[PDB]
Amino acid sequence: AQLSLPLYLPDDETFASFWPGDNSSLLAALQNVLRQEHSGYIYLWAREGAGRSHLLHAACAELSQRGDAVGYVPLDKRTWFVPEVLDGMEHLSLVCIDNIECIAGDELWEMAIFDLYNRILESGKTRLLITGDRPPRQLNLGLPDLASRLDWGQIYKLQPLSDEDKLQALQLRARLGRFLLREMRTLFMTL
Amino acid sequence: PAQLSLPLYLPDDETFASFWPGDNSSLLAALQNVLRQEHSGYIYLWAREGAGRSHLLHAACAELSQRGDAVGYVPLDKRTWFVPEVLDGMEHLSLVCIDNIECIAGDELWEMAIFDLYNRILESGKTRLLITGDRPPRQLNLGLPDLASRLDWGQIYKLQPLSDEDKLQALQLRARLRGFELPEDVGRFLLKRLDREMRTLFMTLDQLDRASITAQRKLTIPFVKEIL
Amino acid sequence: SHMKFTVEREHLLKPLQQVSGPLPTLPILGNLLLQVADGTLSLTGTDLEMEMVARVALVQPHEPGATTVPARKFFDICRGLPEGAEIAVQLEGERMLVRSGRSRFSLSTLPAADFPNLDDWQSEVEFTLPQATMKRLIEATQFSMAHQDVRYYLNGMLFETEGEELRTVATDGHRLAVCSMPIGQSLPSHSVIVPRKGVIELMRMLDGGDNPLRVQIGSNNIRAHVGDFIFTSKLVDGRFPDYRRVLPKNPDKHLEAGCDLLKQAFARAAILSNEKFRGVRLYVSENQLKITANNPEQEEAEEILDVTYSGAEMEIGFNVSYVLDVLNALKCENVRMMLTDSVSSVQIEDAASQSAAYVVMPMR
Amino acid sequence: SHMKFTVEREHLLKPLQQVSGPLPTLPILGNLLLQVADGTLSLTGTDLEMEMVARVALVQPHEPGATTVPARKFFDICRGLPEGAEIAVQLEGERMLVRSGRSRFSLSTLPAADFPNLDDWQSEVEFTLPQATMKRLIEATQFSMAHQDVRYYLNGMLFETEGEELRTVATDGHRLAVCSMPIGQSLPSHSVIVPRKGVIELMRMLDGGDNPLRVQIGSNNIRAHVGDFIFTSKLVDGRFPDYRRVLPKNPDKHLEAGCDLLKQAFARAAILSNEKFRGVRLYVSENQLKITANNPEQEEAEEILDVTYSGAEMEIGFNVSYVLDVLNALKCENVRMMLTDSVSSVQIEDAASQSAAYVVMPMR
Numbered sequence A: 001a002q003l004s005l006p007l008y009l010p011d012d013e014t015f016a017s018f019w020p021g022d023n024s025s026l027l028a029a030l031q032n033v034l035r036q037e038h039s040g041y042i043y044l045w046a047r048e049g050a051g052r053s054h055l056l057h058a059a060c061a062e063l064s065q066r067g068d069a070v071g072y073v074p075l076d077k078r079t080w081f082v083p084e085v086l087d088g089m090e091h092l093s094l095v096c097i098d099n100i101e102c103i104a105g106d107e108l109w110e111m112a113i114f115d116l117y118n119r120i121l122e123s124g125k126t127r128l129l130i131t132g133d134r135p136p137r138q139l140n141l142g143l144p145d146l147a148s149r150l151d152w153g154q155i156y157k158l159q160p161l162s163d164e165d166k167l168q169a170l171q172l173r174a175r176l177g178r179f180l181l182r183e184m185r186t187l188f189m190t191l
Numbered sequence B: 001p002a003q004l005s006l007p008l009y010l011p012d013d014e015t016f017a018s019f020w021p022g023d024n025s026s027l028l029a030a031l032q033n034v035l036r037q038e039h040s041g042y043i044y045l046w047a048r049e050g051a052g053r054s055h056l057l058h059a060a061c062a063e064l065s066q067r068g069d070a071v072g073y074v075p076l077d078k079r080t081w082f083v084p085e086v087l088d089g090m091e092h093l094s095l096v097c098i099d100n101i102e103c104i105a106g107d108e109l110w111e112m113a114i115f116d117l118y119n120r121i122l123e124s125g126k127t128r129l130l131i132t133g134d135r136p137p138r139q140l141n142l143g144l145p146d147l148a149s150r151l152d153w154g155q156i157y158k159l160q161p162l163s164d165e166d167k168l169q170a171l172q173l174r175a176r177l178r179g180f181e182l183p184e185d186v187g188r189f190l191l192k193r194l195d196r197e198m199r200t201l202f203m204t205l206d207q208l209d210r211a212s213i214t215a216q217r218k219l220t221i222p223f224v225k226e227i228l
Numbered sequence C, D: 001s002h003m004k005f006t007v008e009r010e011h012l013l014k015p016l017q018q019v020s021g022p023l024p025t026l027p028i029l030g031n032l033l034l035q036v037a038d039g040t041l042s043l044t045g046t047d048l049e050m051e052m053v054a055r056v057a058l059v060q061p062h063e064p065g066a067t068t069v070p071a072r073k074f075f076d077i078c079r080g081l082p083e084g085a086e087i088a089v090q091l092e093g094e095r096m097l098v099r100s101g102r103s104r105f106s107l108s109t110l111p112a113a114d115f116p117n118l119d120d121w122q123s124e125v126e127f128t129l130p131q132a133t134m135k136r137l138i139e140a141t142q143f144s145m146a147h148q149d150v151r152y153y154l155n156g157m158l159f160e161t162e163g164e165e166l167r168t169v170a171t172d173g174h175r176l177a178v179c180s181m182p183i184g185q186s187l188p189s190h191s192v193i194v195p196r197k198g199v200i201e202l203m204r205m206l207d208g209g210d211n212p213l214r215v216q217i218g219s220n221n222i223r224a225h226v227g228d229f230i231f232t233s234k235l236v237d238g239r240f241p242d243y244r245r246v247l248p249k250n251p252d253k254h255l256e257a258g259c260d261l262l263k264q265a266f267a268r269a270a271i272l273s274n275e276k277f278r279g280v281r282l283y284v285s286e287n288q289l290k291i292t293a294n295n296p297e298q299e300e301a302e303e304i305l306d307v308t309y310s311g312a313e314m315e316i317g318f319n320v321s322y323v324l325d326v327l328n329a330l331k332c333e334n335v336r337m338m339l340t341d342s343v344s345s346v347q348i349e350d351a352a353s354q355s356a357a358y359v360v361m362p363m364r
């Protein structure tokens, strides 16, 4: 009350379509916090096209397939929604904050993220996954309280696929090439 | 500084080297990962009896003390010998070890201090926090619910006690590290007569080694009885 | 039951004073456990950590019983009574009545069954030494204990028996003190940590005499018998650091000086030192020591005194309070300082006897 | 800035100690005004309310000048120096240099022209009395002064000369004390109010002797000469109440008792009195006094003692601290209590001499 309209994401970024190497230690901890009922906070960071958003969508679909409530907040598309959309997300099983470096210098959004952190911290059972371009200590944030909180957790560096793993990653989606090869965002889009 | 400090060397027999891994392979990996530089995290280690919760806190302290980092270990079971005001300033330390946090259940004077210390190292950075206990943070009946959700906020691990197989070669591991030699017939004799009490086993080694040093004879099965 | 006893005032004052001392923190912890058992009177006082029992011989008619009574109030009453007065004590209801002549006192009481009784343990090492020896072992090391530290094992004094000598060690992470005195019997090797307040109470119970001190060190408790007083204290369940690993191994600089002239020189230099950090710097040279100090008020004080020294020249800083504590514990003629370099510990001891040694860490 | 003098250590200790006492609150007020005038040395210390000057004879070469120097530091230096040492003092820049042997001290100074000098007033009444008489006049009344009261005239002691006797009075609105001692000369009738701290400093400057005390009471200041010390203090500009109007006019009840037995009875009854209000009740009857007290813990204490009393029976309450203060000031054999009724003042005095009287107001 009320039920929800069945919308399926028009993509294919599930865990099954994601290649382990060389992020074997990251995926091990990522699938550990996704297991009920305890939660935590993991920060992922990489340069470009490494799959930081792929893992968030995979973690969203991992809990969506078992009936858990999830929320994905693309902070790079924050020009289409308002910071008040994070209110109430402390009652969700998983919250994904994609591209948190885009709010560097945005006090209106830094305060919303900062308040949302303390809300799921005062409560329990709320998995928090945040991705970025640089480690949380390299994030130029006007709020120093938020910077120490983003550094308060387990931080992993995402390793982009080599040109070898990149090939068999493309064929993995065809089941669910060397001529097309090296921008992975357009490679999987080309299929 | 100023000033310097006394080179007081305590029983350094409890390090990561003298600690047997199994079956805490996943725990020891994340433990040595927050001891990286620089990494600030919070790990909770709960177990039952003699699983080495204080061993891993002493191991993490000696790991950072050997490279010049300031450390702090707060045994909450011996809290009758100090005051909650001893936590003040520990937010500037590289590592803070809170041992046996279940002893302050109902101690609102100490729960507030632990609660304030968490927020102080949370507002700041570069402060590793390691807390041990009897039961998971949710199974810990704390007076202040704000603290329970904060001890819940982090990575929680269940320490696994050594099997009777690994228990033997953990006693032999302390022999080679200390200098003496514990043969396999004497080790499997102490596990029977002392009834597999790891707290007293490694404590009995000093009694059996020292009496063997002042002879100076080798460890044989009837020699242990003569020492007794 | 019905407790009742009558005893002279002169038989209670000293036992009361010994069991009623500076000890907040719990209603019954401020009371004394009175109990009459034919034909003695036992006065007990504790603080959940240590207890103190005194036995008083009753030669006048009495009736067995037990109760508790506010210590300081009951002591001030017996102390305020005239000299030679008899004290009649009996229970009437939930309060105790004290009578001496035309003086009548009624004191609110608490049930004796609610009194914390220390579980009697198994004694191990037991020996008898004079009170002067125990007082020397305490006084020579007491000041180096730590107060309310996270290092709970440092908040006390280490009693260690080894063969023929009894040795006490105390350190606070900045300076160490170790004394050693011989006894007349062979003792098994054993070491325990007596708490701070235990050390305080253990020394104040020592009087002139002429009675020896029976000490019963156990697995987790310590008990000291002297006269008719039985002091018992729990032990600090911790591992005390090795003091032999602290003593400066192979120093190359030795300095002898008059203990008094050195003590007075540091005392004068401490006047113009920093009020908070107490920083002074020692400059050893050819048969000369130069002690200087200065404060944020830019006031400088210089003290040069002739010493017997031949080692290499060195400038080393110190906390003048730590150095003065060592020179005050060394009630002797000349002192000996054994140094290595400016950033390492320095051993101070008496130039005559070597029964007590001291280690102080310098400043930068 | 050219002062220089040299004097033995034994010539400075006692003068320094007299000018370095309980006196926070202003930079130069914590300094001593040193000033060399051939051939004496003057050491002054003040607090804008009173001053203390000491003169030291200089027999060694010196140069005129003046400066200020931290009192406690300068005192601790001269006190820390060995016995018999000479102290060479000279000015080098904005700081003072103290040298004694191989010891050199540099103390930051403040300009001597900024030192508060008391404006020399016109003396009026002047007399000379022994130190024992002044000490008796103060000790018998000091404890009855008030501390920082809106009745500013009560925060001190009333010095009153009348013909042949010098009388001191002190009261705090609850109890009054008045002592009177005769001198050898006739004095004009005059009365002034010496402040609390002035009374304290006036008595601590009294020693064994054998020197008399020259006192110069002025219009608004008082000056006391003893030895080479000249103490000067401002007076409390107020009207002190009439103590003769306070003394119980025509009492009808007189009680004599042993001073010690009465003091010890009140002391034992004070044990079980209220910790804050200190309430005890006296019940006088036929040749008997019954002192009882109780506390919120419902603990009662009863003290009955035989006295010489024939008046009507009365029950009157008292602050046991006020009564004990009077019995402590009356270092005598027997005391005399003169009462009227339960809600009126009671006069206590020595049964032997009537040179000092005390009045205490009862409780409800």
Ligand SMILES: Nc1ncnc2c1ncn2[C@@H]1O[C@H](COP(=O)(O)OP(=O)(O)O)[C@@H](O)[C@H]1O
Pocket (backbone or CB within 6 Å): A013, A017, A018, A019, A020, A046, A048, A049, A050, A051, A052, A053, A054, A131, A161, A169, A184, A185, A188
């Ligand atoms: N390990 C991987 N295995 C398979 N595909 C991957 C992997 N990493 C990245 N990709 C591909 O790249 C895309 C990841 O999205 P991307 O824009 O790279 O996110 P981010 O910009 O946060 O790294 C997905 O479409 C996915 O197909």
Ligand SMILES: Nc1ncnc2c1ncn2[C@@H]1O[C@H](COP(=O)(O)OP(=O)(O)O)[C@@H](O)[C@H]1O
Pocket (backbone or CB within 6 Å): B014, B018, B019, B020, B021, B047, B048, B049, B050, B051, B052, B053, B054, B055, B162, B170, B198, B199, B202
């Ligand atoms: N994995 C291990 N390897 C070596 N020694 C161990 C191990 N686990 C426990 N011990 C030993 O067992 C003893 C008992 O530890 P204990 O203090 O009882 O742990 P806890 O604080 O969890 O109760 C310790 O002295 C430790 O040296």
Ligand SMILES: [Mg+2]
Pocket (backbone or CB within 6 Å): A053, A054
């Ligand atoms: Mg993306």
Ligand SMILES: [Mg+2]
Pocket (backbone or CB within 6 Å): B053, B054
């Ligand atoms: Mg333990």
